[PDB]
Symmetry: C2
Subunit: 140 residues, 2 copies
């Protein structure tokens, strides 16, 4: 079950296609850029990613590069892979040094070498939307 504790919600954001180039990393900062439900008090619980790569390789979360060797996760060419990263109820300012890094055995420069599904993020429920306090001045 992907059902969450009552005070959490899922949010999602589309992932960009990867262009050709000349290691690969998606910073957590970038993943959350522009999600309106997220502000500086938001607590983060889970990050789900899913992808298909054109090569075998490894990937992992890092914090500061090479992903650490112990704990590196593997993936196979043309095979859907996912991961549920635990974000530990932290705030953005304790996660904005993190990135997911991929290391491909081959086709390391090809466009679309990794194709991500949308990112899913379990976060603390934001404050409900409210219109401005004085929106209904001169309403009759």
């Amino acid at each position: 079950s992907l059902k969450l504790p009552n005070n959490q919600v899922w949010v999602t954001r589309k992932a960009s296609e990867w262009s050709a180039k000349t290691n690969d990393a998606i910073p957590f900062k970038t993943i959350v850029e522009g999600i309106p439900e997220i502000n500086s008090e938001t607590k983060f619980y889970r990050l789900l990613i899913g992808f298909v790569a054109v090569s075998d390789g490894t990937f992992g979360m890092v914090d500061g590069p090479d992903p650490p060797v112990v704990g590196r996760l593997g993936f196979k060419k043309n095979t859907y892979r996912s991961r549920d990263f635990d974000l530990g109820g932290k705030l953005l300012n304790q996660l904005d040094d993190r990135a997911i890094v991929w290391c491909l055995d081959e086709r390391r420069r090809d466009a679309k070498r990794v194709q991500l599904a949308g990112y899913w993020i379990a976060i603390s429920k934001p404050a409900p939307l409210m219109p401005p306090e004085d929106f209904l001045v001169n309403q009759d």
Copy 2:
């Protein structure tokens, strides 16, 4: 007065476009369909309760909601506004579904400067609706996660 809602209603908002100058002298109309277009929280089972608009116009005039939708807003229900004076309205949407409101429009009738750009400048639209279903990732998202 508080804008707090009942009972698993939420507010949603969408930006309103600037109005461009126009060639033909007609009254102006924003269909409700257009106001709600692209709001993800809204689906075919959504119930609607309130629509709030706020605006400033460059002329005195009148406005109102109309159905069966460019006529002058009917006399019954017809609201006035003054030049350069913030005006708002809380339209009651009666708990209706979209398919019972998608003939509605808000119509403005300006006494003057009827073709000028920015002749009406709208704030964002605010809509009180029934809470939608929470977002869920696809059931099979975590295949091959370990």
